Design a protein around this ligand. Structure first.
Ligand SMILES: [Zn+2]
Ligand SMILES: [Zn+2]
Ligand SMILES: [Zn+2]
Lengths: 147, 645, 65, 648
RNA sequence: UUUUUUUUUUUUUUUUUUUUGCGCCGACC
DNA sequence: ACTGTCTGGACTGGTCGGCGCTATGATC
DNA sequence: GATCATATTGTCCAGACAGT
């Protein structure tokens, strides 16, 4: 059908999607599918023939705020369904920020990238001596792209 | 990696329930660092005497820590009342703390010997009548800020400390007694150089780092200020988190300066095995180093929270206590005699496979402060020795005439009404000077007050907190007699700048022991500035003065020194005071002392490694040892790996 | 805890897999996908990405790690 | 592979700018890229590139890199027209056999019996033909004796051209990831072969690059994997392999104790990168690995690796010649010099930094002249650290001289051929067997013997490889092959069997003959069958040229025991009676003795600062190190395994 | 019967002196 | 060019004292 | 039973402006 956006509480998109799915199953709502990417915070995607079905499905839930008044083209959310490694798309020599891990809130420079083990080796920029460290690909965020 | 800690714990529990009578009621058996903890419901039957605990410790070859079950716990007020009633009034108990999570009561007393008992029977009596496992620590006669802060940090983070100890105990006993296929020794720093010491002990199962330190002389160059972080073995150990433990020989910046840096960037998460005096002194020195780097305007190496994390990850070991820090490595500490808490690291890898002794900084002659270094070991194959004074012509003067000259110079200065200013290190020579002065003044030689400014008072308090780590004479005076040499009324502490100004402006003679040997900071510079024009005063140098420092300028004989004034104009200091230099109070071992230690060590090591000194000095010491005793000697450079077995 | 299958990317609360009967399930997964209609556009997009996905309506995971 | 900083783009831009400044406009530079150590330049109009031969030499000297000039793929002659032009333009005496074209890179592979005519004086013929054909030429020698191994390797390389080109491009990008860099420290860790024989492993580590030298396996202690394989548990080796920081692997010579562990890394994808070795060494080590897996399969034990791993090793091997300086790392330069041990044996010379340090790893080598190969090179431009073998480092380890050993072999063959007796010489396919055939051919050249010699097994393949690579042989053999026009290998007395029927009917023929077979330990192959069928034959002689290990049939034969019970196939045992005299001549070994080692130490130039003795027994290594230190005053060491020595 | 790589010395210690805001209500001049 | 409409804003100074108010739902 | 992210988006005077 048509892709619609539902604004939900940040960090609790999966539970809201599960409640919407259970309500649709129990009450026979005309809901086609629900997509809740982990990278997107506070927003979920629901496929329905019309926005009235989405509005009727999300009502009665404290954690579903409102439905965005618009229709998303499928090309915008097409890349979300494709499975790609988090390490891929990273090149050595640039600067990244570590969102999670033991090095939370630290800037680092990418040194080595390998897609086989899904790990990326980075060097802290604030360290007085270069100490390479191995961190997960999804933990880092690209601040700038140079070389 | 694969672990078998559960099977080992099950076997240990089976052995315990086979040996311990059933009436004890054993509930839980777990590992807390390098010691075993057993929880029972009837402590009376478990420890009616020390023979059962001794037999259990001998059979299991572990440190047994019997604790009551948390369900059977007396109320804290009733427990405190019972503990106070049981302990004799001679032992003045100051603070009592309780741990609701695990059965343990911390007792702070001025006389821990009475609380512990003649053979530990008082601890058993307390934990039987009160159902609380007792831990006794000494309350120092002089209050120490660092020790109080460390104790408060340990008490306020009990849950994190217990979790860290449980993780360390699980990691240590991941497998049973394992015979290492090979033993490797690599030096990441401190090899053929002075400072930034770093020793890595590598086996096929566990890795051990020894005295991770920093260099202050070459702090401008990052390639020489810090140990070699680019070593492939060290990189592999740090990246995979295979570092089992870190052991610090003694509390100095060249042996413990780089320790908080690992915790700053979360490069390490295991335990640190130092003596409590070493831990306290190294925390004080690291805090002072961070403050100095902050004041100089440069970027600090780490933060005080990193020092707090180092405190939270430190396990305290006493002298002569054997603990298992790895599946194949056993660690014990022996007295070194260099400074307070200085320990010679002895590693027992395997079940008699090999033995390594890392002396570090040590002294082999008796001193006024500490006993000479331990030269007897149960087994010794490889010896790692310092070479600070390894030169052939390096011969420090004997102590007795050096202290006689110091005493006569001080007496001559005080005879004419002058003031004696003695710049000194925060730890080491300063306490020896205070002990010599106290001995001289105890017979009524001098009545003038002795003023300690800066870190001298804190170091003195830390020294008072651990009298068992001192020499036999001071131990006999403190324990057998009622006299404490550090508690002499002549020793006074100046609180603020007003007290220092009153001391300077006072016409009465006095002795001032500052905390900066090079007159590069602290109250030493102010004392020198305000006492230089007076010809009656004198300044005594007890340490080497580096080039480019004010102290070297005064020592060389400069009558006037141009300095920057408060208003931004050049100021001239007229040095009319007498200048003296007595370098006989150095805590480092002499070349003759090193040769005597090599000759008198038992058993004779198969090989000797000379480190911690200049390259030519290390080579000269190794060649002299090889020519005199025939033992094979090596003086490897940095990033050099030696396969001992 | 909820774990996702490594073969059909199906999240189930029991050891048995009600789609392919696989015994290797991963406890770490992201980007939960809920399928209520087989002929959905996103279900068709997931079908050409992972062949075993979107066969039966239910919970699904984009990647397995 | 693993992605790195890869600053090669700026270096390539600077190199292209220098080329544009130096080379004229009419050359037409289109694409400049790195294919391994060499530099590849694509030109639209190659006519103006090489009107004079001095321009390419000047460009190579300025850029300090090997330069291969190829035409742009946009313009290319048709393969049939190009082949016709090449055939009709080269002299007819070149005898071109096979021509292969690679349109992806515009390179043509030419196989001829005489590559010298194709190349000509300083490459003038090569330049002229590639100017007239618009195709980059590569010339290899077609051996007079057909070689299955070399032909298979060439076919594999040709059929896998695109993946080989991609691998070469990746290697070239990894090599020049940085400019001329001066290393801060150099250390060497011995993962194997230190104070022991076999399973050698030398790891050269700098602050930027890591180099592995002579990764081999041990066959004497193959039962215990700890003593058979190099130390994989070393923290430095684990860090290098896990992070993929191994820049290159260099093999001194083809042996199981120097190159037996190579397919293991590619079997489990442990290492991905270039391997630098001499092409004879590559062919012989592939043959040795195939023999090793074959005998492992025959013994019933699980093989260490599959032949596909050997194919992967072949596809990841870069071939270098003697005296060719190539860059394998941003700070390390590699040069290969003759060693004289076996065919293709090389002495690894490493030039780390810009004059910072130099390391020479001799490995197995010989210093006296040899009929097969020239003596080892003792002169180097710069030398600071020397690593040499110590197999015969003992004071009493003096070997029996070759000349009178050859006299004894000649008189033995005379006394066994006057009576018409058969000869059996068990020897390895790579080692002393070729020297034995050369000695026999020289003896038969005068006219002393005319009985043909039969080579059974892998001896024919080694002979074919030797014919394919005659430039690596001795000066006398090179002279005879090139200017005299006589091939000692092509003597009519040298015969090769076809199958088991030829072996059977030459066994039952009864005529006197000389038989050379592989598996000198008599653990398998045709040697055991030949000995079984030769034991009851009266009046025959067998000559042993190598040391015999315990627990083998050769040791029992050497012991002179009258009764030799040998267990046969299908679980049944057989008993034979021997009346066959045994001869022991251990004078053809390719390992230098103590006197040769001392002579090499004394005559080396320049004198190294330190000498490291490896590849031998611990007592022999210590004795050799102490003797060198006492005689010459050089600081020598005999390090154990897992020992790192900091050099600079 | 054979081509295109290079080579060497000057920066020192184990460390130091005091409740803001928000709004409401009542009230005085 | 007039004319009704929309929008923005300021709402006298000081003083006295009192009386509240400044998190919450969901795992682990 | 302890912690952690998140927590929603009164009338009148004067100036500017559509409408006729
Ligand atoms: Zn030290
Ligand atoms: Zn499944
Ligand atoms: Zn060899």
């Amino acid at each position: 059908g048509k892709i619609f956006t539902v604004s939900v509480t940040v960090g609790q998109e999966t539970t809201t999607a599960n409640l919407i799915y259970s309500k649709a199953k129990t009450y026979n709502l005309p809901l086609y599918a629900i997509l809740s990417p982990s990278k997107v915070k506070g927003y979920i995607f629901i496929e329905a023939p019309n926005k009235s079905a989405v509005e009727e499905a999300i009502r009665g839930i404290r954690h579903a705020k409102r439905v965005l008044p618009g229709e998303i083209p499928f090309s915008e959310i097409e890349h979300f369904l494709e499975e790609k490694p988090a390490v891929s798309g990273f090149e050595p020599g640039d600067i990244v920020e570590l969102i999670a891990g033991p090095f939370k809130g630290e800037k680092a420079k990418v040194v080595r990238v390998d897609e086989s083990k899904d790990e990326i080796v980075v060097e802290l920029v604030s360290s007085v001596v270069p100490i390479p460290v191995t961190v997960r690909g999804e933990y880092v965020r690209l601040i700038s792209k140079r070389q | 990696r694969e672990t078998f800690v559960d099977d080992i714990l099950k076997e240990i529990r089976e052995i315990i329930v086979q040996m311990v009578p059933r009436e004890a009621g054993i509930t839980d058996v777990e590992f807390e660092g390098p010691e075993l903890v057993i929880y029972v419901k009837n402590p009376e039957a478990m420890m009616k005497d020390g023979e059962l605990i001794k037999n259990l410790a001998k059979v299991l070859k572990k440190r047994i820590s019997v604790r009551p079950d948390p369900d059977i716990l007396l109320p804290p007020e009733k427990a405190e009342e019972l503990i106070k009633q049981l302990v004799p009034p001679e032992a003045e108990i100051t603070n009592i703390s309780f741990d609701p999570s695990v059965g343990e009561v911390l007792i702070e007393a001025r006389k821990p010997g009475l609380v512990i008992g003649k053979n530990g029977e008082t601890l058993r009596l307390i934990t039987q009548k009160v159902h609380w496992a007792p831990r006794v620590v000494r309350t120092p006669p002089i209050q120490s800020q660092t020790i109080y802060s460390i104790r408060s940090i340990l008490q306020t983070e009990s849950k994190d400390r217990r979790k860290f100890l449980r993780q360390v105990g699980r990691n240590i006993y991941r497998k049973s007694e394992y015979k290492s296929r090979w033993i490797r020794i690599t030096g990441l720093g401190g090899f053929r150089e002075v400072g930034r010491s770093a020793l890595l002990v590598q086996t096929d199962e566990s890795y051990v780092l020894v005295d991770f330190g920093v260099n202050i002389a070459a702090l401008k160059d990052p390639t020489k200020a810090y140990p070699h972080f680019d070593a492939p073995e060290f990189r592999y150990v740090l990246d995979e988190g295979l570092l089992d433990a870190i052991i610090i020989t003694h509390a100095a910046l060249d042996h413990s300066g780089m320790l908080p840096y690992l915790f700053r960037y979360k490069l390490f998460d295991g335990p640190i095995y130092t003596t409590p005096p070493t831990r306290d002194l190294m925390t004080l020195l690291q805090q002072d180093f961070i403050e100095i780097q902050h004041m100089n305007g440069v970027e600090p190496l780490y933060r005080p929270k990193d020092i707090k994390e180092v405190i939270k990850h430190t396990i305290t070991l006493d002298y002569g206590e054997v603990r298992d820090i790895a599946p194949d490595i056993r660690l014990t500490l022996h007295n070194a005699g260099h400074i307070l808490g200085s320990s010679i690291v002895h590693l027992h890898i395997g079940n008699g496979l090999h033995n390594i002794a890392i002396t570090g900084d040590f002294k082999f002659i008796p001193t006024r402060l500490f006993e000479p270094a331990v030269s007897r070991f149960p087994r010794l194959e490889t010896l790692v020795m310092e070479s600070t004074y390894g030169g052939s012509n390096d011969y420090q003067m004997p102590r007795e005439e050096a202290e006689k000259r110091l005493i006569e110079v001080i007496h001559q200065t005080l005879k004419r009404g002058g003031k004696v200013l003695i710049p000194a290190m925060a730890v080491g020579r300063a306490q020896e000077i205070m002990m010599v002065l106290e001995e001289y003044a105890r017979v009524g030689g001098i009545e003038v007050p002795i003023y300690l400014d800066g870190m001298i008072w804190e170091a003195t308090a830390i020294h008072t907190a651990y009298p068992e780590y001192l020499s036999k004479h001071i131990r006999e005076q403190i324990f057998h007699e009622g006299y404490n040499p550090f508690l002499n009324p002549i020793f006074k502490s100046v609180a603020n700048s007003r007290e220092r100004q009153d001391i300077i402006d006072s016409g009465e003679p006095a002795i001032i022991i500052a905390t900066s040997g090079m007159l590069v900071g602290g109250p030493s510079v102010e004392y020198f500035k305000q006492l230089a024009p007076d010809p009656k005063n004198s300044i005594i140098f007890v340490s080497y003065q580096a080039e480019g420092t004010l102290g070297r300028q005064v020592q060389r004989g400069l009558r006037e020194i141009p300095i920057v004034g408060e208003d931004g104009r050049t100021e001239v200091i007229n040095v009319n005071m007498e200048v003296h230099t007595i370098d006989g109070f150095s805590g480092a071992a002499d070349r003759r002392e090193l040769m005597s230690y090599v000759a008198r060590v038992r058993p004779r090591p198969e090989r000797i490694i000379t480190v911690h000194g200049e390259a030519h000095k290390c080579l000269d010491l190794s060649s002299s040892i090889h020519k005199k005793f025939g033992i094979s000697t090596r003086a490897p450079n940095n990033l050099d790996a030696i396969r001992l077995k | 805890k909820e774990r996702a299958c490594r073969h059909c990317h199906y999240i189930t609360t029991e050891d048995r897999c009600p789609v392919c009967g696989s015994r290797d399930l991963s406890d770490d997964w992201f980007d939960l996908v809920i399928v209520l209609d087989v002929e959905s556009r996103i279900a068709k997009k997931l079908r050409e990405s992972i062949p075993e996905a979107a066969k039966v309506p239910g919970k699904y995971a984009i990647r397995v790690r």
